[PDB]
């Protein structure tokens, strides 16, 4: 209420559709940081904003995510379901203490950060445009890890040194949450 997010990204043009390209991280890399939020969707749907990016960082092993989860209506589906889906909760390990992290870290493991094409790359205009959450199309990027905070979430991840890990808790400790818009999320338990 909410969570964190983390993990490193694939960076994918024109996502979904036909003329879909995944480009490689030194692509982009003059391009980074992005301090500013950018919104956080599922499967780049954009009617399914669930909370603002923190933060992208280029590090030693690619480009790393940290980001906010604060949609009210999604955060407490996704408890619902984990508490009370059998669905949900088949392909995670038994009686787990987080639920709700285990399901998303499991249902959700792919970050993808969407970009222009590589042709467009000195751009016009901004270069990227969201970060998905996805439970397909995971290539380069990590499995996504969820956490109540921060600190714990990029400190999972080994490939992530400790000063590298200094300069991202940097930024995301500089971001106000509560400042941020409330995601277009809805739920469609409410909905439909
Ligand atoms: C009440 S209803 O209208 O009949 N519900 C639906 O039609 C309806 C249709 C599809 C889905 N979801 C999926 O198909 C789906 C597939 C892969 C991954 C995910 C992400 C996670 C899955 C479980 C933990 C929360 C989200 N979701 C949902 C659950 C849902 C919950 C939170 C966010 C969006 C979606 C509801």
Same mark, same amino acid.
């Given at each position: 209420?909410?969570?964190?997010?983390?993990?490193?990204?694939?960076?994918?043009?024109?996502?979904?559709?036909?003329?879909?390209?995944?480009?490689?991280?030194?692509?982009?890399?003059?391009?980074?940081?992005?301090?500013?939020?950018?919104?956080?969707?599922?499967?780049?749907?954009?009617?399914?904003?669930?909370?603002?990016?923190?933060?992208?960082?280029?590090?030693?092993?690619?480009?790393?995510?940290?980001?906010?989860?604060?949609?009210?209506?999604?955060?407490?589906?996704? *408890? +619902?379901?984990?508490?009370? $889906?059998?669905?949900? @909760? %088949?392909?995670?390990?038994?009686?787990?203490?987080?639920?709700? #992290? &285990?399901?998303?870290?499991?249902?959700?493991?792919?970050?993808?950060?969407?970009?222009?094409?590589?042709?467009?790359?000195?751009?016009?205009?901004?270069?990227?445009?969201?970060?998905?959450?996805?439970?397909?199309?995971?290539?380069?990027?990590?499995?996504?890890?969820?956490?109540?905070?921060?600190?714990?979430?990029? *400190? +999972?991840?080994?490939?992530? $040194?400790?000063?590298? @890990? %200094?300069?991202?808790?940097?930024?995301?400790?500089?971001?106000? #949450? &509560?400042?941020?818009?409330?995601?277009?999320?809805?739920?469609?338990?409410?909905?439909?």
């Amino acid at each position: 209420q909410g969570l964190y997010v983390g993990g490193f990204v694939d960076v994918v043009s024109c996502p979904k559709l036909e003329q879909e390209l995944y480009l490689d991280p030194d692509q982009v890399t003059d391009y980074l940081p992005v301090t500013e939020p950018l919104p956080i969707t599922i499967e780049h749907l954009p009617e399914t904003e669930v909370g603002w990016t923190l933060g992208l960082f280029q590090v030693s092993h690619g480009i790393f995510c940290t980001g906010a989860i604060t949609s009210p209506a999604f955060l407490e589906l996704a *408890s +619902r379901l984990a508490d009370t $889906s059998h669905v949900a @909760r %088949a392909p995670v390990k038994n009686l787990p203490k987080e639920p709700l #992290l &285990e399901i998303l870290h499991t249902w959700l493991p792919g970050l993808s950060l969407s970009s222009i094409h590589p042709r467009e790359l000195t751009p016009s205009g901004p270069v990227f445009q969201h970060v998905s959450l996805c439970a397909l199309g995971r290539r380069r990027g990590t499995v996504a890890v969820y956490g109540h905070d921060a600190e714990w979430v990029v *400190s +999972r991840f080994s490939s992530v $040194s400790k000063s590298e @890990r %200094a300069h991202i808790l940097q930024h995301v400790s500089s971001c106000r #949450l &509560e400042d941020l818009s409330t995601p277009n999320f809805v739920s469609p338990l409410e909905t439909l």
